[PDB]
Design an enzyme around this catalytic site. Structure first.
Site, short mmCIF file in Angstrom:
data_model
loop_
_atom_site.label_atom_id
_atom_site.label_comp_id
_atom_site.label_asym_id
_atom_site.label_seq_id
_atom_site.Cartn_x
_atom_site.Cartn_y
_atom_site.Cartn_z
N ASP A 106 0.79 -1.22 0.00
CA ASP A 106 0.00 0.00 0.00
C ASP A 106 0.83 1.29 0.00
OD1 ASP A 106 -1.94 1.93 0.48
OD2 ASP A 106 -2.79 0.88 2.22
N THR A 107 1.06 1.87 -1.18
CA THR A 107 1.86 3.10 -1.26
C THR A 107 1.17 4.31 -0.64
OG1 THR A 107 1.05 3.59 -3.50
CG2 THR A 107 3.08 2.31 -3.32
N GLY A 108 -0.14 4.20 -0.41
CA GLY A 108 -0.89 5.30 0.20
C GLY A 108 -0.88 5.24 1.73
C1 XN2 Z 1 -6.10 7.80 1.38
C2 XN2 Z 1 -5.70 7.23 2.48
C3 XN2 Z 1 -5.01 8.40 3.29
C4 XN2 Z 1 -5.83 9.09 4.34
C5 XN2 Z 1 -5.25 10.17 5.14
C6 XN2 Z 1 -3.83 10.61 4.90
C7 XN2 Z 1 -2.97 9.94 3.84
C8 XN2 Z 1 -3.55 8.84 3.04
C9 XN2 Z 1 -4.85 5.85 2.73
C10 XN2 Z 1 -5.53 4.73 1.96
C11 XN2 Z 1 -4.97 3.36 1.99
O1 XN2 Z 1 -3.92 3.43 1.05
C12 XN2 Z 1 -5.66 2.28 1.25
N1 XN2 Z 1 -6.61 1.55 2.18
C13 XN2 Z 1 -5.85 0.36 2.73
C14 XN2 Z 1 -6.83 -0.37 3.66
N2 XN2 Z 1 -8.09 -0.76 3.01
C15 XN2 Z 1 -8.89 -1.46 4.00
C16 XN2 Z 1 -10.22 -1.99 3.51
C17 XN2 Z 1 -10.23 -3.17 2.59
C18 XN2 Z 1 -11.46 -3.79 2.03
C19 XN2 Z 1 -12.72 -3.11 2.48
C20 XN2 Z 1 -12.81 -1.95 3.38
C21 XN2 Z 1 -11.54 -1.37 3.91
O2 XN2 Z 1 -14.17 -1.71 3.48
C22 XN2 Z 1 -15.09 -2.62 2.71
O3 XN2 Z 1 -14.02 -3.46 2.12
C23 XN2 Z 1 -8.79 0.57 2.54
C24 XN2 Z 1 -8.01 1.34 1.49
C25 XN2 Z 1 -8.80 2.56 1.19
O4 XN2 Z 1 -8.84 3.49 2.09
N3 XN2 Z 1 -9.43 2.64 -0.04
C26 XN2 Z 1 -10.27 3.72 -0.63
C27 XN2 Z 1 -10.74 3.30 -2.05
C28 XN2 Z 1 -11.49 4.08 0.17
C29 XN2 Z 1 -9.54 4.91 -0.86
C30 XN2 Z 1 -4.84 5.58 4.32
O5 XN2 Z 1 -5.80 5.05 5.01
N4 XN2 Z 1 -3.71 6.01 4.82
C31 XN2 Z 1 -3.38 5.96 6.23
C32 XN2 Z 1 -2.77 4.69 6.83
C33 XN2 Z 1 -2.95 3.29 6.56
C34 XN2 Z 1 -2.22 2.29 7.31
C35 XN2 Z 1 -1.26 2.70 8.39
C36 XN2 Z 1 -1.02 4.12 8.73
C37 XN2 Z 1 -1.73 5.11 7.99
C38 XN2 Z 1 -1.84 6.60 7.95
C39 XN2 Z 1 -2.35 7.02 6.60
O6 XN2 Z 1 -1.36 7.17 5.58
#
Ligand code: XN2
EC number: 3.4.23.16
Lengths: 99, 99
Positions: free
Chosen positions: B25-27
């Site tokens: 997960d690059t995000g």
């Molecule tokens: C943008 C977002 C962000 C928010 C705020 C600041 C920067 C980036 C990232 C997103 C993350 O890359 C991807 N994330 C991985 C987990 N799965 C989960 C999932 C899978 C399947 C599903 C579901 C949820 O719901 C129904 O089915 C969700 C997915 C996600 O949020 N997807 C959508 C399409 C809604 C955008 C995120 O959550 N980042 C945070 C983060 C993450 C891990 C550890 C530390 C941190 C801090 C942040 O960088």
């Protein structure tokens, strides 16, 4: 180009005529943009993130330019803290993860 | 390896001597895994994403093998919807985005 991950991979995108900064997110299945008034019909949708679900608006066939690369696809608009380019669009610009 | 994004970028990881599946997960800034037992002391922490914030357990300097590549860093454990490998570890294995 080649993007390292020492910092958030932010890039410039062009959508609806506006330039914005978006995060290239391999962990995101869909593309989610910050609230913006796009023209056209849309349908309600719920997408799940780390801390729960948020309600968004789904727009289809939206032209979007990513770092100079043209793409077209589904975009979800809602209260997101940041613009996210997901896999649906990353595949279109031939983006890959390498190590 | 070179990984395309038509399917979720899942990989096998080995941690605490156990095998698990995780998303590149690059995000994600940090790495967060589903509830599990890890040796050593932990500190309470809160991380936020889409949908809101969640409470996790922070374990420091934890050895972890990602698709054959060794890394040693911070690993968060909590009610995450899925196992995610964030930038803190992706940088250690020399991961980059290319297009
Ligand atoms: C943008 C977002 C962000 C928010 C705020 C600041 C920067 C980036 C990232 C997103 C993350 O890359 C991807 N994330 C991985 C987990 N799965 C989960 C999932 C899978 C399947 C599903 C579901 C949820 O719901 C129904 O089915 C969700 C997915 C996600 O949020 N997807 C959508 C399409 C809604 C955008 C995120 O959550 N980042 C945070 C983060 C993450 C891990 C550890 C530390 C941190 C801090 C942040 O960088």
């Amino acid at each position: 180009p080649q993007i390292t991950l020492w910092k958030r991979p932010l890039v410039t995108i062009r959508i609806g005529g506006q330039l914005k900064e978006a995060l290239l997110d391999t962990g995101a299945d869909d593309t989610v943009l910050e609230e913006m008034n796009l023209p056209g019909r849309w349908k309600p949708k719920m997408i799940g993130g780390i801390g729960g679900f948020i309600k968004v608006r789904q727009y289809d066939q939206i032209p979007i330019e990513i770092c100079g690369h043209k793409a077209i696809g589904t975009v979800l608009v809602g209260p997101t803290p940041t613009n996210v380019i997901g896999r649906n669009l990353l595949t279109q610009i031939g983006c890959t993860l390498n190590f």
